[PDB]
Ligand binder design. Sequence first.
Ligand SMILES: [Mg+2]
Ligand SMILES: [Zn+2]
Ligand SMILES: [Zn+2]
Ligand SMILES: [Zn+2]
Ligand SMILES: [Zn+2]
Lengths: 528, 257, 44, 49, 427, 93, 39, 117, 64
Amino acid sequence: SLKQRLKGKEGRVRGNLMGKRVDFSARTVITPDPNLSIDQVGVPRSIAANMTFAEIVTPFNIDRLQELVRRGNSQYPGAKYIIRDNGDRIDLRFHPKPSDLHLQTGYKVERHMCDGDIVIFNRQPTLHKMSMMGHRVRILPWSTFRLNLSVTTPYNADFDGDEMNLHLPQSLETRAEIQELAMVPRMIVTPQSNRPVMGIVQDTLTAVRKFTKRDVFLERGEVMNLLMFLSTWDGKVPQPAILKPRPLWTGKQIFSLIIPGHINCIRTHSTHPDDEDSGPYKHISPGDTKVVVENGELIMGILCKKSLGTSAGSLVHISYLEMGHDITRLFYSNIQTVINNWLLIEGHTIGIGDSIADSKTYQDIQNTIKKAKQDVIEVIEKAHNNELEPTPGNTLRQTFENQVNRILNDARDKTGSSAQKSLSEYNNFKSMVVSGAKGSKINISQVIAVVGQQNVEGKRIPFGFKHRTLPHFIKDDYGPESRGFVENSYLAGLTPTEFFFHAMGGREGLIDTAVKTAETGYIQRRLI
Amino acid sequence: PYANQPTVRITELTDENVKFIIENTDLAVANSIRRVFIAEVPIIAIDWVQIDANSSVLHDEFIAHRLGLIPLTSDDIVDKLQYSRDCTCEEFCPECSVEFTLDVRCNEDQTRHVTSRDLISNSPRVIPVTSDDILIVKLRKGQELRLRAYAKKGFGKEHAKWNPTAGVAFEYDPDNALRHTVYPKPEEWPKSEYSELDEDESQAPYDPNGKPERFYYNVESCGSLRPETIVLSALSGLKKKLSDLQTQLSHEIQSDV
Amino acid sequence: MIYICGECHTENEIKSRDPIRCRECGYRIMYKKRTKRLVVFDAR
Amino acid sequence: RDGKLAKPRQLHNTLWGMVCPAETPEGHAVGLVKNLALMAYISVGSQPS
Amino acid sequence: VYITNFHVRMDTLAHVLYYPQKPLVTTRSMEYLRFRELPAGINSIVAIASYTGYNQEDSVIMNRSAVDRGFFRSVFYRSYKEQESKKGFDQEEVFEKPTRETCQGMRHAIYDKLDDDGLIAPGVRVSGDDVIIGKTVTLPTKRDCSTFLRTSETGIVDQVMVTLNQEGYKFCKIRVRSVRIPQIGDKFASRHGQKGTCGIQYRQEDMPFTCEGITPDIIINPHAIPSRMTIGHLIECLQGKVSANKGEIGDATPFNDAVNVQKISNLLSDYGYHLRGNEVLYNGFTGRKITSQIFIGPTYYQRLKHMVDDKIHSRARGPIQILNRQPMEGRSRDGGLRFGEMERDCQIAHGAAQFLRERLFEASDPYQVHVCNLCGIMAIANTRTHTYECRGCRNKTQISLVRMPYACKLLFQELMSMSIAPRMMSV
Amino acid sequence: YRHLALLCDTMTCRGHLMAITRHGVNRQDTGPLMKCSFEETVDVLMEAAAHGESDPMKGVSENIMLGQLAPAGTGCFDLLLDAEKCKYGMEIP
Amino acid sequence: SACPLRTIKRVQFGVLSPDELKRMSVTEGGIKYPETTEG
Amino acid sequence: MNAPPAFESFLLFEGEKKITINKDTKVPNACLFTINKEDHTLGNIIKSQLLKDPQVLFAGYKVPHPLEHKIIIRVQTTPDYSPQEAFTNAITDLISELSLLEERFRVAIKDKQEGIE
Amino acid sequence: MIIPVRCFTCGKIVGNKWEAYLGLLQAEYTEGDALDALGLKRYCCRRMLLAHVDLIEKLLNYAP
Ligand SMILES: [Mg+2]
Ligand SMILES: [Zn+2]
Ligand SMILES: [Zn+2]
Ligand SMILES: [Zn+2]
Ligand SMILES: [Zn+2]
């Protein structure tokens, strides 16, 4: 029926009035490119030779446009239509002789998409307004979209078979609006939490931390090679920090050339001992902490996520507040290029020598676990002989199992502290954890010391059989190993019964994420 | 402000590898000639196949690919052959090509191996390396194969079928006298083949005013060129690149007025 | 044109608008014979 | 295939040795389709006479 | 390789690897499911290091001059069906070579590859937008149909089969062969849940080498390990290095309890390398040593099915529908991307009012209508003679125009068909 | 803070607690062409055609359903050309 | 085309009378035959 | 076909010119050479030679994109010297080094026609 | 399906060593010793023969 012809979703009121399907829109995979500015994107030549842009003919661009119309649909930088004043849309593919075509003021050529154009780029789910920023075209050989890395944080992207769309503004008013409203250097700080969204990222952060240590000296050739990559260099070579016995520059001395203008900032490094501001050496800092950027040059301190990432009061935040939106772009690009071209001299890796513990540590960890098991046995036996006293508002099982859980937590904390206690300065796990690039301080202990204690539904492993967890135990066993305590490390490998409990914990942790996406998407749609 | 006087010294010489040592030179020059043994030494190989009848198990583009990777004797007549894009002939001529021919038919019941002994050429200077036999395909009673191929000239930047060498070893400073690499525990590392340390030492003592010299090479060969003409044709090829670039340069700063 | 039986591999010219069967074998699956215009490949 | 009730999706201990504990698809069909272990054997039926 | 008689089966979408290999570290329960007679993968030499930044965030660098020797090369088959049919007493189809002056509905494509039958002989090189089967329908003269390829195939016709299907109609099947060399979009995965695309390909003269000239085939990022803790990946490349030097094939039966990291370490030292798989690598560009020691060894990788040749598409002023005049898919596989509801809100928060209009109206079904001034109803306009007449009000003087989308027009027309007059007053 | 304040202010503006739900949005002084975009087009629009409801087009979703400049930013105003400044303006063409 | 392209400012609803229904219809007298085409 | 042919990496087109000079305007006595259809094999061999000149203040090179074929070289010399001078003096010193090493090599291989031992 | 003609990493010619490899394993040799009697000393060229599955011998069972 007629009222049936205009139903809800996919009717005529909710499926073709506000949500529809547009043209001049492409789609393909994305891959990294550290040699692009944060406001550029890389487009293949098969997409660029397909989408067009109508350009009005004026006596300022008559010769260039008739040259473009000489070559059509065969050479790449060409054109494929001429729209004269009458509305006549002629096609260059079928016209017998092109030379007769004489462009005239008022005509309108349909150009091929060339370098310097402006596009709009978004990712699959659009959550906040940073998930659709205006980029700038730059055309490259192969067939994937190429974009910088510091911009992957707003889009929430990663390069394992992802895809993104682009739309090409056709008019000139829309081009101007996109240019002065939504270009990516204009959306560095967000109004949601008044802090930057783009910071230095995965691989450049680990290297920036090592490049600004107290002892990094560069020769002459390497300093020249690094200065070759600065886009805002005035042309002068600074005087080395060590003139004799031979000239050597320092890491901070080269980094002081990247920092724009004359800004001021004071932060701390993630290993600042809290008892340093108390005694002397408050302004000396034996460990080289308390970053100090005075008058636009690094005087002291190591750089990390607390001082270059996306937090309030960072270096990028201050550079945006004081200098503007067109200098922070150069800041990002220069940091990335210089640090990558030094990293291919310094190198970085991870192996199993970084995952190997020491003899003493292995021994000590075993002892703490043996004592932890002894305590759990005491509590259980004490409860059977009915020597436990429940606490206010606690059942005996509660009181029982929560005391056992507290003992297990204390044992796990001691094992973790022991695992943390033994690392070296050359370790490559500590190098990604300290700089804040990737990882946490518990993965170190899980790889080296103890995996810990599993639990489903927020509680210990339940009795899935009748009064048992598996047919390899005796009934009503309440020990630590019989209800989920994995006492090995990922390196030393797990035993079968522990491999099963680990699978259980992982499974519940895997289901929750599957639910969360749909729930949050729907509620946000309603509210908006 | 001038060049150096490098000195060569050969250690081994076989029909498939050369070991030598280049003293008193710079690292950038000792590496730029390590990339020329691989990429820019010309050689002959098949680059045009046309199949008349293929009733074997492998499809047509499988056999056209196992043919190009067969190495042909390119010893002496690579200098007389033009590049087929430079030669003033048509698509092909005996001045910039060599024509091959294969034609095999299996009639007995026992299976048949189609080796490289079947590639029959017209020029007796370029033949596959047979003077065992590379296998191309096996045939069953009632199957056959016949084709025609031409063999052009190129180097290893086009395609990896035109490079003349297997693995090319290279190394310098066998003991960390310069500390170019930093060992965390210098005791677990095996001692190099070229080292001169004692049996109970790990590294030489650090010396700051040092510089890398005395590079060690080891160039093997796949079978096309002798292992000592791979080197002579590389140095004579790199020299002719700079010598041609100096022409274009002086032609630029002369036309500056 | 010319067709090849699917069992005995005996070529037999089948005329336009004619039933599809072999001869000497009585079979109903035919494969068309390979063309005679030549195409060239690259060893690359 | 979309019900949010977890108890028909979580891993039961009784699945020991008869259904593979690790192999299952992600998405909306988590824990709904399952593969059986290597030596698991399903009965065919008989009469009780 | 999925089955041994893959030559006979004309399946659709069959992938086949050139050189499969069986693992060097095997579980004992793989002899019973035939994984050493139909394997899927190749043992590659993997190094875990950060080299130039092109393998960050789940990517891999791979050796270019190993791809040129057959590494992970494969093929790709595909089949097409066509069936001649007598749908009516007069409407009848037939395989034949359509000629230009007799048949009428043909495009501007070449029809020279077809034979007299109407099918392509096997062996030719069929490219995108070529016709392969010529099928003409008789008109109550002759109105031809045909089947064209998809876009960007560049295949080679493998073999053509002709026979009779179930209800006895003649029908044919055609298989197209195409070779796929690994490139920098393809997806590779290990045996422990580490998928990742390919970032860039370096030649052998640029990869880092050991002190005897062993360059790795694949380089992966060290940051992939510490967050997801897959240490089983770090032992099979240590166990694998003992199996290639001794000549056995290793054993990885789960809880065997027969192998320790410490035990394997002792054996490697005897052969002559750093005890913990670590080795001293030289830089490939400058020949200098690398200060750290890199963990290197052989592992077993697989090549997943998602290739990049299949996921790239673009649209720029393509074919549109007929009823609603909305962009439609065409013969080139390539339609438009949907501009959903959540994308309509990021643009509103941005404050971009022009770009929001272009994407929804000027890019999708633009349209113009004429509207009367006193009443708000559409009017009749014959612009050939320049007569703008409003019926119902006898207005000819003050007519107007309103540029609006097309999908909103026929919404108004289906409201007028239910006794509702939506009036678009311009003031 | 501004976001929390604005949300919890527009949520309790009409005096009583109206949930952001199906029948919480169903009730306000809104036009007819917005309640037709939500699952009860025909009946409420028949009510409107019977009672003779107007529609001022001040909304944003109202104004993009007909393809016009929504009165959001960049549409909150309109420009006029003045004939005076053009006088002392140069002219190449 | 000569008529000015203007805007919309208000949409008024209402039921339309049979009077204008007959006055503005295009097929005078009315559609009578249930068969669409004859030859 | 969305992949370039292999010969585009070394074969010059018709309109292109292999080398191009531009003067840097930020500092005196600086120049910027742009060699076309080239890579690290030739780029690095030049830079190491310029640094051996005691009258050169700066020298470096970069490949601006690994997927295009073009390098850039920057030189700066003392006020009594010319960048175009220092550049061509570097090349003639490489050629004088390679041709010398070829003679010393061809002697070493014929030093064991029958064998020294 | 058939032994590659060149190792993927080095470039050394392998395609002529498959029949000799089967001939050495035929008598009494271990895989570790047969590979040394052929001159394969890098572990990238030993992976070539050690992990090769020969599928061409099973496609010759179907009559042409
Ligand atoms: Mg992803
Ligand atoms: Zn010729
Ligand atoms: Zn027959
Ligand atoms: Zn009117
Ligand atoms: Zn090898």
